[PDB]
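Table S2 (text version). Query chain:
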Amino acid sequence: DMILTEEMQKIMNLIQDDENNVFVTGKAGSGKTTFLKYLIEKKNCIVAAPTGIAAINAGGVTLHSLFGIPFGPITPYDRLEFSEYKVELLLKMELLIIDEISMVRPDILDTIDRKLRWVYESDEPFGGVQVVMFGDLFQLPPVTKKQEREILSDFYDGFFFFNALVFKRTGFHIVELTKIFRQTEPEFINVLNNIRNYQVTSDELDLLSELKDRKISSSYDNEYIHICTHKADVEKINADKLGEQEIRNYDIVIKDKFPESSIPCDLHLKLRVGARVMSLVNDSLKGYYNGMLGIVTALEDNVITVRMDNGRTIKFERYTWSNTQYTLKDNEIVKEEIGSCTQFPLTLAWAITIHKSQGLTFDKIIIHVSHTFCPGQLYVALSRCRTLEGIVSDAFITKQMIIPEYALIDFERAYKSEGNYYGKRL
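Corresponding structure-token output:
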């Protein structure tokens, strides 16, 4: 029963009308995780997400398992091929909540609309199911694959969630959660907005021209976290610094149904005294959050002792994640656990990918710059830090790296100034 901000209350008010679809967007620290739970507990809801890990963290299921969607691009001209229990479950679903919506390739939402119209024997978008989407508009979608682009270009204007064709027959309200439950600094807020919008003056450019720090960016013993685009580089950094001397291994325990690809922790956690680690979950009692950094001080049978950068020492214990699915009983939808996995909620953290650090921020970051940066990617990397002064790069910033994702700037400018709604008005 959190006290809601005005924005949170606005979203609850909009959803009270069952005909309103809503997109909730917010940056790291905007309260989305807790408010999503609040909204779920405050209709028959099913929570779903585009990937196994995201479904596990949202307490829900994957879109592909929920709606029996084959993987790969599907066009509107592709004919679609459900159990008795599933049809009945979907018919009872009054509210579909999709977490990490920016990572949902638009054809997936159209397939879902088509599936729900079939199940409901309805011409209404999504069969009339109310849809609420949680995400971050400037969290970039998975890079478009060759087999996706040629197939989908004939039907889609772009490769962002809101390009789904269903939003020409229906639409959604948009509310941005703008309160950050973390110290922020106004100049940095304004610098990041100007870079995000590619509206820069010498103010932003002079700062970008001086980001390179050969010393800090080549150090791995300074409590900076190295932010990289590719998992291959992160794996190599963490493995290098881990080394092979006095390593201890902690194996995951997986019970019953839990696809390996949905596991949000390490299968084989390998550590040593002095290893840099990050906590993976929020624990108010123990005093750590998802993204907090520290240094291993002791490795025992069931306890990993870590001195966090703030100077607190935490005795980490094994954590258990739950894999759930939805069923009925009697005409109500209930969640039931179908598996779990048990592991210390820690992973090596000399480096981390832009992707695995979605929704996190750090006091000090080293951005590994590359000439393959996609549009808007530099903005995302910068947004991983909490202040201007905590950021260094390993190489000079170029003009092409500031190029933004104009489709996203465009989407935001439109809804901010044309009524906080996208798509077809009811």
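Notes on Table S2: The domain at 6-181+407-423 is CATH 3.40.50.300 (Rossmann fold). The longest strand covers residues 333-343.
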